[PDB]
Amino acid sequence: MPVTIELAVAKTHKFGTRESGDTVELVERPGGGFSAVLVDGQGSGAGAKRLSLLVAGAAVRLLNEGVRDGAAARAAHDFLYAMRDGKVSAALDILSVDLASRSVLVTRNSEVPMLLGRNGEFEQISESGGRIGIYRHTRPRVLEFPAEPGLTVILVSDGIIGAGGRRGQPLEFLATGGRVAGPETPAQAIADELLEAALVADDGRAGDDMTVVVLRLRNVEEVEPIRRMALTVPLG
């Protein structure tokens, strides 16, 4: 069947800082479809943000050129490894729906778990290639799923996994994801609600930058092929 892609993001910064070192960039693939690049750079605040932007940018450039996701992740690593002399790490994920291969690809270098929903049944997946920027020969670990209606992917930054840690009551990630992801729940509502649960776990003072990325594939129930995108930034 034809598929509709919903992607959504909800994110905030560590309490006490004025910006996040987590970057999510969205890029249109020249073969059709889209990618989200999630980078969580070492550190917080201004410097962390500058570097996460450039790391994301290294991957986004290559994706724009139709370079394959794995190669793009390796390039982002090579960039960070060269520019910071093997001293700074970052978590990197690339989450793609490739409308030419009819596939969802997840290229992971993060050491944070993800959730996968298969028609409402969620599981936690710990497979990743670990962080980029430090080991010379770092490689992504890769997941590929047929792009069918009912597939959901939830990717987070470590600030979500860390929520509650301050008071020794860590967020139960898999349990909270399955809870919030109802059958008709839109991607944005999953992302919003997972982030809110993490914020409640940190008593409203994020202990680290927090980012939730949700992909939901569903059946087509809009007849005109309209593409939409929206960004909201409160408190600019």
Among 9, 91, 160, 161, binds a second copy (CB under 8 A): 9
228 lines the binding site for a second copy (CB under 8 A)? yes
Which of residues 31 and 127 has its CB atom nearest to a second copy in the complex? 31
98 among annotated binding-site residues:
no
**Which of the choices a second copy, Mg ion, none does residue 164 contact, using the CB cut-off of 5 to 8 A by kind?**
none
| Nearest-angstrom CA–CA distance, 72 and 66 | 9
53 lines the binding site for a second copy (CB under 8 A)? yes
158 among annotated binding-site residues:
yes
Q: How many Cβ atoms are within 10 Å of 28's Cβ, its own excluded?
A: 12
Considering only residues 5 to 44 of the shown chain, the ones binding Mg ion according to CB under 5 A are 21, 40-41
4 lines the binding site for a second copy (CB under 8 A)? yes
| Nearest-angstrom CA–CA distance, 17 and 76 | 26
Among 160, 191, 194, 198, binds a second copy (CB under 8 A): 191
CA 169 to chain centre: 24
Which of residues 78 and 192 has its CB atom nearest to a second copy in the complex? 192
101 lines the binding site for a second copy (CB under 8 A)? no
Which of residues 48 and 199 has its CB atom nearest to Mg ion in the complex? 48
Q: What is the DSSP string of 133-166?
A: SSSTT---EEEEEE--TTEEEEEE-HHHHTTTGG
Q: Choose one: 70-78, 81-89, 167-175, 217-225; the region binding a second copy (CB under 8 A).
A: 217-225
First to last CA, the chain: 41
| Nearest-angstrom CA–CA distance, 22 and 42 | 9
Which helix (H) or strand (E) segment is 56 a member of?
Answer: helix 45-64
Q: Which residue has the tokens 């987590």?
A: 22
CB 81 within 8 A of CB 137: no
| Sequence-ordered alpha helix ranges (H) in 84-134 | none
Please state the residue numbers annotated as binding site for Mg(2+). Answer: 22, 40-41, 43, 158, 208
Contact positions vs a second copy (CB under 8 A): 2-13, 19, 23-28, 30, 32-34, 49-50, 53-54, 56-57, 60-61, 64-65, 97, 99, 102, 147, 187-188, 191-192, 195, 199, 204, 217, 220, 222, 224-236
